[PDB]
Design a protein around this nucleic acid. Structure first.
Lengths: 337, 185, 201
RNA sequence: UUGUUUUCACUUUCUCCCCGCACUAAUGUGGGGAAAACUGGCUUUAUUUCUUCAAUUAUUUUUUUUGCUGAGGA
RNA sequence: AUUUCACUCAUAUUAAAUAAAAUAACUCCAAGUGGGCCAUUUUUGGUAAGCAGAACUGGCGAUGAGGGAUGCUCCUAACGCUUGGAUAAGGUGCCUAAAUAUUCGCUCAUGAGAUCCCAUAAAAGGUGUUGGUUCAUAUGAACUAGCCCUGAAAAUGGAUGGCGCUAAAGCGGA
RNA sequence: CCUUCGAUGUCGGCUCUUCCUAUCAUUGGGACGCAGAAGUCUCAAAGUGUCGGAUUGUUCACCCGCUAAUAGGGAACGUGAGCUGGGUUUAGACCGUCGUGAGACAGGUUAGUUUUACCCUACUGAUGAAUUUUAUUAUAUAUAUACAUAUAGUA
RNA sequence: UGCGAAGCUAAGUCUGUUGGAUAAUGGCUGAACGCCUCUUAAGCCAGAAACCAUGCUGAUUAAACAAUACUAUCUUUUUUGUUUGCUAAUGUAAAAGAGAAAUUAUAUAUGUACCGGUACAUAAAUAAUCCUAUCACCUUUUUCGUGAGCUGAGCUGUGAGCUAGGCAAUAGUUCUUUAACAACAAAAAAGAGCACAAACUGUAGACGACUUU
């Protein structure tokens, strides 16, 4: 029979299965779309976990009860050790998805990037990307002509440099960042300049725009139902313990449904936070970017007392609303909206 | 029930046509004609020195013989519509708030305001090549016209349903944007 | 039936009749490759077939939808499943017959210039009243969530131009072959000429 | 409380005429009239292989190509 | 009334027909059984029931085989081991052997319909189709009945058996 | 009384999930005996939500409130190797009525042991090989090829 | 007794979109019957927290796949074969010409040249078609094309052909016509690095696994 007191279920089925994520970096399912009218520029970025902090502000929303009065908010400041752009990948649409036409590497590559292709770097001969970077430019010209004639999605392999960060890790995280904008004829020339240099964030990131955050949440191992889905605790009189779901399904169907909350792994999931507007642009070396002309004190992005389980921060900064997922030292990925 | 149906459509003097595989291409005065009538089984006989069209339907059963009549009177009627433009009698109505018109961009993308006092945006288009523009004689009247019969008539059709209000008895509140009569240039 | 493999252009073919014929060929052992499945047409209104596919879509195993009927949205996969429902796929011979079938949307690479065959027993022009209502499998699949109809259309129009070019080459090749034949006929001995003339060669 | 007998009204055409005079689906049509009848049927005469001699039933006689079977041992 | 003598009523097809009618008749000994159920037709109680209780016949039990997708009781048909032929019931679009056979109509369903038992459907609405009937001077009605539609809502996801089928692979014929 | 009496754990509550629509609210409409409000009838619609407490073992019920609404139901009257044991329904005991009596009471009351998962499957998570009669939406400088391709390890 | 770092935690903080056709709902034309008439005639539009997309989560849910980087004695041609548990070695779901490129419309379409039109051809049992097979050998006369090498061109080779000549099949009547493809073994000729473990880490964890050095 029916329940006498109908109440909403526990957890969301949209985040199933609640299993350990396969990787550590934040993958991107979807990049922001492109338009012919809009001009060819960048489409995403990446970095690390610099801070999810506060800032004091003043609302300009008409009729707001606070408005002119000073307020306190919650935004974030990003860690951007400049990423090295190393590769170019072309994709063409097919009825079986978008397929890789080809990838092209920079004629010179870093050691940190190449270290990722190994599991025992200290014992190898470091032979990766050794004789693959001595190709003639006739092949490059022919294949980029093919890219223009056939390819329709352009992505750039960029890798981070953990040497700048205090991380123990020496392998470089590699991802691909889409390039969005105009037609192929303009796009070919617009993708012929930045093919080797490192990536400054302030190149495209501008104030008053929306971005999203991709990461992998923390980890807690196996946890009970009361933690994984927040089920009601059974009364203290319960015989075989109280931290469990009482009924895991009716008599029929004669099976356990997949909607029943059960014990298992919680955390180490893939998470994306949407509607995160970027607000301000700054740097790393300069001394007054974060502060204002009404604050008239001295400070830079530098923190105090060190960062617990993160070391010190010696790289770029911007501003963006919200707080982030993951743990300390965890790679974070930044997308546009 | 018999085996032949046809309508000996009378071609007026001011029109010249050419039939080809239920795709008749015609020239009048304001422009040219063509039509996609491929849904219906139609055969056509044509002459041009003695004129008159003969649109026919073989094995004419009254199941679908009501369609040849529609297409035939329609055919003579686009002939008339392109030769002389058709004018329905559209009148805007306003019980309390006189209708605010914003005729932006030359008969294309008109805007409607001042209808019950919402004071918001309301814009309804029409098929290109058809005019629905203010008649200078009376402000609340718009002299609809255009190229062809369907061209004028769908424009006279879509406009009435654009500004409807809610919770107000239309037996007492006679608000609307009416269309009354039909004439020619 | 007896060819190494038969390539069928599914354009303008009724789904059920096409599936029945193809399944009979697979069971008899003839390998079949079906192309341009996104122009398969189904009798009945597009809304009717959309309702049917929605009823099929709402149907899944309650305990775990993973083992539920995999619905599939590509028209090629729809035709493949319709054919599978026509033959005993639960047995070894039926499984072999099912695996003897290839389905493609549009015309992929190794089907540019092998003769695409058409079975008149499943044509719309012969198996459907003109005044009655029909649908299009590509449109229905796009409605039920394929989002690849336009790409197939652009590939198809490019292929149309590409094939038209070499058809224009082939027609001139053939019309020069016929004219060299006309002159080579009179260089053959008369008694051999007579047999060709009276046998229409 | 039956039979019998009697009257007109019927058909061909690429026939023709006139009117709408081209209004035909056509190398014609809507209407009104004239023609013979090359339609047709009727009786004959030698012939049915120039040409039909059908179909069904009753009564007979063959024929093309081929599947399966070989019990027994007087 | 009985008995005995005479005569004699087809007896060479048989005191009407038909009959693997003596596979008869009789006697003895003895097993099991003695809860029945279902189908057509008839019928009692009950609002009704896959309910309870009866009659006839045939089945299930006690019995498989082909078919009705599926099924103790429905149709064909009852059974030694085989080889050929031809069929019954039922089918011939694929599953599945055999007709996308021929021929004539009807139907478009935004929950069509599709083999007895059988797996529900009613009152009330129908100027679509076709054919009627009656009436009033090619002119208007009324009905009538075939298909289709509304009436027509239930819980795991779902079932003309599935796929699917509309110039049917649907319905009624031939 | 068709299946279970060589046993399918018989009330309620708690917990938890899913499903139906004959929709309570929310969404968009039509009608009103609709001036507007407010409301009533009704359509498409199950996406979202349908509560806190007093009394009672209760379902049901009835009040106090909040709410936007506090809609109706199914899932072996969903759910006891999930719980609890308040009731019903062993044995003790009390009262009332009935009985000569032992005792009886869908009359009332009080106290009264709630067993086992380590098996299969299902579900939740966690490792993980093998995969040629197997796959191809290509590979070629306006030009050929399936009569081709495709080794395998690591990343 | 206090804070009680960090972690955990909430009772604390941040975040939680637009596109399509669409149900109900009004019109264009318009028959049926002279004409009117949303369609129990035809075609077209307006439009919902519902649907499918978008976005998000898995994807050993596809026993799936792509690109890239590096490496493992490796790759082509010929002959004979595959008639201690092993160390030569063979399997076909289908060869017997397994021959075949416009696209499209079905109440007629495809080309050609002009500006959807124009005029003209083509096509309408369309695969009921076309194309492809047997002339062996060797000798002579030579002709025309393609490849090695050679300087648009000479020679040789290859393919096809022309003139003339003389040269073979035989196993007793058939038991599949051993004829295809792919693979492998032997023998010749030519060219052609990593991962696990170990210690460390702790962004991870029941153990595996995962992140590192």
């Amino acid at each position: 029979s029916h329940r006498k007191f109908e109440r909403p279920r526990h957890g969301s089925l949209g985040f199933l299965p609640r299993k350990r994520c396969k990787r550590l970096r934040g993958k991107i399912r979807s990049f922001p779309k492109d338009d012919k009218e809009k001009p060819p520029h960048f489409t995403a970025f990446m970095g690390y976990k610099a801070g999810m902090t506060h800032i004091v502000r003043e609302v300009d929303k008409p009729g707001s009860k606070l408005h002119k009065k000073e307020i306190v908010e919650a935004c974030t400041i990003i860690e951007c050790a400049p990423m090295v752009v190393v590769g170019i990948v072309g994709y063409r649409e097919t009825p079986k998805g978008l397929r890789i036409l080809s990838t092209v590497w920079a004629n010179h590559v870093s050691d940190e990037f190449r270290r990722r292709y190994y599991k025992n770097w200290y014992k190898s001969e470091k032979k990766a990307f050794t004789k693959s970077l001595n190709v003639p430019e006739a092949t490059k010209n022919c294949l980029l002509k093919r890219i223009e004639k056939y390819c329709t999605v352009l992505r750039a392999i960029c890798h981070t440099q953990p040497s700048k960060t205090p991380l123990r890790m020496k392998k470089a995280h590699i991802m691909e960042v889409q390039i969005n904008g105009g037609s192929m004829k303009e796009k070919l020339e617009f993708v012929k300049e930045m093919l080797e240099k490192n990536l400054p964030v302030s190149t495209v990131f501008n104030p008053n725009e929306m971005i999203d955050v991709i990461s992998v949440t923390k980890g807690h191992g196996t946890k009970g139902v009361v933690s994984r889905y927040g089920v009601k605790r059974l009364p203290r009189k319960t015989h075989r313990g109280l931290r469990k779901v009482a009924c895991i399904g009716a008599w029929h169907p004669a099976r356990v449904q997949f909607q029943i909350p059960r014990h298992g792994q919680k955390g180490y999931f893939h998470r994306t936070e949407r509607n995160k507007k970027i607000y301000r642009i700054g740097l790393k070396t300069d001394k007054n970017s974060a502060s204002t002309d009404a604050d008239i004190t001295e400070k830079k992005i530098t923190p105090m007392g060190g960062f617990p389980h993160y070391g010190v921060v010696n790289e770029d900064f911007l501003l963006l609303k919200g707080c982030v997922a993951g743990t300390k030292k965890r790679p974070i990925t930044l997308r546009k909206n | 029930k018999t085996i032949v149906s046809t309508q000996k459509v009378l071609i007026p003097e001011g029109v010249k046509v050419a039939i080809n595989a239920r795709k008749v291409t015609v020239s009048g005065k304001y422009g040219t004609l063509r039509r996609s009538f491929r849904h219906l089984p139609i055969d056509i006989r044509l002459n041009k020195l003695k004129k008159y069209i003969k649109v026919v339907m073989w094995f004419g059963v009254p199941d679908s013989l009501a369609c040849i009549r529609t297409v035939c009177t329609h055919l003579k009627n686009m002939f008339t519509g392109v030769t002389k433009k058709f004018l329905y009698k559209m009148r805007l109505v306003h019980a309390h708030f006189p209708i605010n018109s914003n005729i932006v961009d030359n008969n294309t993308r008109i805007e409607i305001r001042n209808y019950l006092g919402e004071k918001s945006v309301r814009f309804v288009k029409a098929l290109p090549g058809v005019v629905i523009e203010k008649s200078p004689n009376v402000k609340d009247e718009i002299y609809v016209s255009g190229a062809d019969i369907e061209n004028v008539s769908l424009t006279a059709a879509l406009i009435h349903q654009s500004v409807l209000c809610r919770n107000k008895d239309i037996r007492k509140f006679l608000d609307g944007i009416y269309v009354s009569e039909v004439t020619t240039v | 039936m007896y060819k190494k493999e038969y390539v069928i252009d599914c354009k303008g073919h009724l789904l059920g009749r096409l599936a029945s014929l193809i399944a009979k060929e697979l069971l008899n052992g003839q390998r079949i490759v079906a192309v341009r499945c996104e122009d398969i047409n189904i009798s009945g209104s597009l809304y009717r077939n959309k309702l049917k596919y929605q009823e099929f879509l709402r149907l899944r195993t309650n305990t775990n939808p993973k083992k539920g009927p995999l619905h599939l949205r590509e028209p090629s996969k729809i035709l493949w499943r319709c054919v599978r429902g026509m033959l005993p796929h639960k047995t070894y011979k039926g499984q072999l017959a099912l695996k003897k079938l290839k389905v493609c949307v549009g015309m992929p690479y190794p089907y540019d210039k092998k003769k695409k065959y058409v079975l008149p027993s499943a044509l719309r022009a012969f198996r459907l009243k003109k005044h009655r209502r029909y649908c299009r499998l590509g449109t229905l699949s796009s409605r039920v969530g394929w989002n690849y109809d336009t790409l197939v259309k652009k590939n198809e129009v490019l292929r149309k131009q590409v094939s038209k070019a070499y058809y224009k080459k082939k027609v001139n090749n053939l019309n020069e072959k016929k004219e060299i034949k006309t002159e080579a006929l009179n260089l053959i001995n008369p008694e051999q000429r007579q047999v060709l003339e009276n046998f229409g060669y």
